[PDB]
Amino acid sequence: GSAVPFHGAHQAGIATPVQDRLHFAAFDVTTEDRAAFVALLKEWTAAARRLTAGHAVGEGAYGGLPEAPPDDTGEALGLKPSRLTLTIGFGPSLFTRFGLADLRPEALADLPKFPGDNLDRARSGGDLCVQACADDPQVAVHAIRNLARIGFGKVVVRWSQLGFGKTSSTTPDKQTPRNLLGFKDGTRNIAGTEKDRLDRFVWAAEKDGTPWMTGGSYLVARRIRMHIETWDRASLQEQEDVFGRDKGEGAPVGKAKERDEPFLKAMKPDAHVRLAHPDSNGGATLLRRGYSFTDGTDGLGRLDAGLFFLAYQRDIRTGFVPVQRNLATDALNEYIQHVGSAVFAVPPGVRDADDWWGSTLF
Amino acid sequence: GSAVPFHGAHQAGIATPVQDRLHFAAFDVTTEDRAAFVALLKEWTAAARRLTAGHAVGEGAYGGLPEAPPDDTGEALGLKPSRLTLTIGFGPSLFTRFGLADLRPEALADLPKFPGDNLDRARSGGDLCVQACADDPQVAVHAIRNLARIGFGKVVVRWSQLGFGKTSSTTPDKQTPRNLLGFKDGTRNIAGTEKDRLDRFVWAAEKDGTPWMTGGSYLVARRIRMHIETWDRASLQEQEDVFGRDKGEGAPVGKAKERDEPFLKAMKPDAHVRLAHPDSNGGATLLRRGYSFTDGTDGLGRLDAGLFFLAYQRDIRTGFVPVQRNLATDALNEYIQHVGSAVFAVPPGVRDADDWWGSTLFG
Numbered sequence: 001g002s003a004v005p006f007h008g009a010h011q012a013g014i015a016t017p018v019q020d021r022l023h024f025a026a027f028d029v030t031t032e033d034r035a036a037f038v039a040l041l042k043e044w045t046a047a048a049r050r051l052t053a054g055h056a057v058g059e060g061a062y063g064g065l066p067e068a069p070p071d072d073t074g075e076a077l078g079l080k081p082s083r084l085t086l087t088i089g090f091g092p093s094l095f096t097r098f099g100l101a102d103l104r105p106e107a108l109a110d111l112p113k114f115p116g117d118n119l120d121r122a123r124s125g126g127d128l129c130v131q132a133c134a135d136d137p138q139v140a141v142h143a144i145r146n147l148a149r150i151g152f153g154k155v156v157v158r159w160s161q162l163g164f165g166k167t168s169s170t171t172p173d174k175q176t177p178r179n180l181l182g183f184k185d186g187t188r189n190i191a192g193t194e195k196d197r198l199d200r201f202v203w204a205a206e207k208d209g210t211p212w213m214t215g216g217s218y219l220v221a222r223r224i225r226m227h228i229e230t231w232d233r234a235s236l237q238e239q240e241d242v243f244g245r246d247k248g249e250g251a252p253v254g255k256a257k258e259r260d261e262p263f264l265k266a267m268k269p270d271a272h273v274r275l276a277h278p279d280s281n282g283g284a285t286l287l288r289r290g291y292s293f294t295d296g297t298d299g300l301g302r303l304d305a306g307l308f309f310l311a312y313q314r315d316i317r318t319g320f321v322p323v324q325r326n327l328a329t330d331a332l333n334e335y336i337q338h339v340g341s342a343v344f345a346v347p348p349g350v351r352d353a354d355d356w357w358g359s360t361l362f
Numbered sequence: 363g364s365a366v367p368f369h370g371a372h373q374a375g376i377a378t379p380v381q382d383r384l385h386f387a388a389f390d391v392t393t394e395d396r397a398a399f400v401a402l403l404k405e406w407t408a409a410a411r412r413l414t415a416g417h418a419v420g421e422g423a424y425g426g427l428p429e430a431p432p433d434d435t436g437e438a439l440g441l442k443p444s445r446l447t448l449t450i451g452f453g454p455s456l457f458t459r460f461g462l463a464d465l466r467p468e469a470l471a472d473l474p475k476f477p478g479d480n481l482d483r484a485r486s487g488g489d490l491c492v493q494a495c496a497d498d499p500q501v502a503v504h505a506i507r508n509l510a511r512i513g514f515g516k517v518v519v520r521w522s523q524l525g526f527g528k529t530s531s532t533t534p535d536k537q538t539p540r541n542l543l544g545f546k547d548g549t550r551n552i553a554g555t556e557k558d559r560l561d562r563f564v565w566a567a568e569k570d571g572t573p574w575m576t577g578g579s580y581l582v583a584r585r586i587r588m589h590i591e592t593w594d595r596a597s598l599q600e601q602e603d604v605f606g607r608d609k610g611e612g613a614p615v616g617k618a619k620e621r622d623e624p625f626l627k628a629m630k631p632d633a634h635v636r637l638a639h640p641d642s643n644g645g646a647t648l649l650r651r652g653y654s655f656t657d658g659t660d661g662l663g664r665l666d667a668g669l670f671f672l673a674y675q676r677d678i679r680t681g682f683v684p685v686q687r688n689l690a691t692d693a694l695n696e697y698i699q700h701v702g703s704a705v706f707a708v709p710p711g712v713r714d715a716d717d718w719w720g721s722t723l724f725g
């Protein structure tokens with residue numbers, strides 16, 4: 001139930017232990033006034049400091065003037081901070097505004113088209129994002145709702161995604177969670193304690209060519225539908241062959257324990273783990289941080305199910321792109337479809353109480 | 363605690379402690395064969411015994427024949443029972459099948475149309491329901507996904523709703539939860555400890571007219587959207603006047619504490635608490651067991667959020683119907699809309715290891 005510190009060289013919500021619940025929102029900007037947008041970023045930062053400490057925004061949820069709307073909507077009153085993190089990102093489309101064109105980072109690359117893509121344009125893209133993660137869904141909804149309210153008239157919500165349970169791990173010392181296909185997901189990631197690996201693969205550096213992004217990261221989001229009718233009639237052996245790990249323990253094929261190192265040549269040549277592994281991709285390594293979703297039924301008598309895939313990396317061109325390209329022949333492709341996509345530059349951390357989100361850019 | 367007993371004179375999930383999370387699904391039946399449906403109820407009951415104890419269904423999620431599909435889909439491996447309850451109910455439309463038309467209870471009444479209703483037919487009705495409540499959402503979802511799989515070919519999923527209340531790891535058991543309008547919700551309700559009130563207002567009795575339903579109850583489900591962005595622009599006074607309680611403490615107007623008994627005459631005539639109170643409705647009293655929802659954002663950028671309202675009662679005609687009728691002029695109507703609806707007869711409990719869901723109806 002404790003608080004995660006909001007200030008630092010980096011934003012929280014990346015290397016932080018993965019929280020139980022997600023509420024992700026993408027926003028489009030509706031003001032042409034640079035000074036007004038800067039004022040919004042400062043007001044959002046002030047609200048974020050309150051929210052992540054478990055306090056109400058502005059002057060509170062009640063006990064003000066009877067004839068005014070309360071500053072805070074009130075539904076988180078009496079709740080603990082619940083490890084709430086709030087992480088902001090800027091999309092490529094932002095840089096066509098406020099005279100920012102020459103500040104767009106090279107590492108913020110547009111993704112190519114990938115075979116099998118079926119992307120809904122309405123639930124793709126966005127000028128900016130806020131990732132809210134917490135152990136309590138009410139706390140996460142409250143944060144997004146209050147940020148959107150403060151932003152009324154300057155930003156609108158383009159699309160949002162809720163995740164009911166995590167399918168990722170930055171804490172190898174704890175139980176690895178399972179996705180809706182029934183497999184552990186998160187065994188070989190990057191842990192929050194692995195400072196050298198974070199510096200090499202996740203955090204942007206001054207020498208990479210964009211000074212304002214030093215200490216930031218780049219985010220890829222993919223909404224992926226799962227064909228669970230098709231999967232649930234597959235044999236156990238089929239399922240295990242798809243991944244290269246057994247279902248019960250999640251060990252590499254032939255080995256006894258989850259965390260034993262994979263021996264790739266024992267897996268099928270189209271196994272997911274074999275294709276995705278850094279040794280198959282010139283060393284390319286990702287920080288995965290996704291969540292499961294279900295949005296009702298599909299109208300054809302079945303539950304809807306999917307995974308909202310989130311990856312952080314130092315450069316989209318050397319992280320997600322080469323790995324996803326290598327997944328063109330993945331056995332898993334028979335059971336999934338990518339139906340939404342977005343990329344964001346995640347700026348550096350808020351250094352102290354006088355700093356603000358985006359201050360290095362603006 | 364960690365598990366809730368499955369067997370009893372009553373089904374669990376009604377009077378048992380309220381769990382943190384909900385997965386509610388409505389199913390339609392596709393078979394005409396009574397024998398095949400009975401066989402399904404028996405297999406579903408066997409699965410539910412396993413699920414509510416934290417075990418996998420059938421022969422398990424792994425370690426069987428490699429060339430067969432696993433009996434359990436495996437996404438709950440490693441999780442705890444999480445106080446899972448599974449509660450089954452039968453809709454009015456079931457009784458048009460299997461020769462059951464003369465066994466439909468009179469208390470399972472069709473709802474009238476109410477002012478302001480805007481019901482989505484696709485998210486309404488259903489032949490059957492399963493209410494899955496648990497502290498971990500993945501335990502609830504795993505239960506619904508596996509029941510649906512076992513039934514494939516005999517039932518389909520018509521509609522499904524996820525919901526949330528409190529998070530018990532961080533929030534005290536005695537604290538009333540707040541709804542998404544920011545008000546405490548549940549202060550004046552029937553509690554699971556109130557045996558006599560449950561017998562008066564919730565459980566069906568033999569003398570009520572339908573012997574097979576003795577020890578069962580009747581459920582009304584309403585999916586109620588909130589107009590969040592409109593509500594959030596209302597003044598504090600306007601919000602408090604809508605309910606007849608204050609927002610911070612949740613006390614009735616002119617009182618000091620949440621649990622002080624209301625004085626109805628101090629509230630505005632169309633305040634929600636005044637219209638809903640038993641004294642305004644000839645003594646009519648409900649067990650509310652609903653959950654908040656947030657599904658996403660709609661095409662206009664607004665939050666798709668609200669209350670998935672669940673009420674249990676001894677007779678729909680003397681519980682939900684009179685009370686909802688009395689809300690025709692509710693000040694709250696400006697900020698909500700009922701967009702889905704269904705009613706179910708929830709049979710008596712599974713008595714022991716040889717009993718099965720629906721045995722009093724089917725024989």
Ligand code: HEM
Nearest residue numbers: 179183184185186187188224273276277278307323324336
């Ligand atoms: C619904 C989609 C997906 C499912 C169900 C899935 C499932 C899994 C599972 C079960 C593992 C093995 C346990 C682990 O080490 O985490 C794994 C590993 C991995 N996945 Fe995926 N995955 C999906 C999509 C993706 C995508 C889109 C990418 C990247 C483009 C990706 C990259 C990886 C990586 C890098 C590993 C670690 C390989 C290693 O170093 O051993 N996955 N995935």
Ligand code: HEM
Nearest residue numbers: 541545546547548549550586635638639640669685686698
């Ligand atoms: C979005 C919809 C609704 C909201 C936000 C809401 C909110 C509330 C609140 C805040 C209270 C006062 C605290 C408490 O005693 O629980 C209350 C009481 C109550 N509500 Fe509602 N309610 C809603 C819909 C309904 C419906 C549809 C019914 C019945 C048909 C209902 C019946 C009652 C009853 C019986 C009480 C208790 C009155 C008493 O005995 O003091 N509510 N509701």
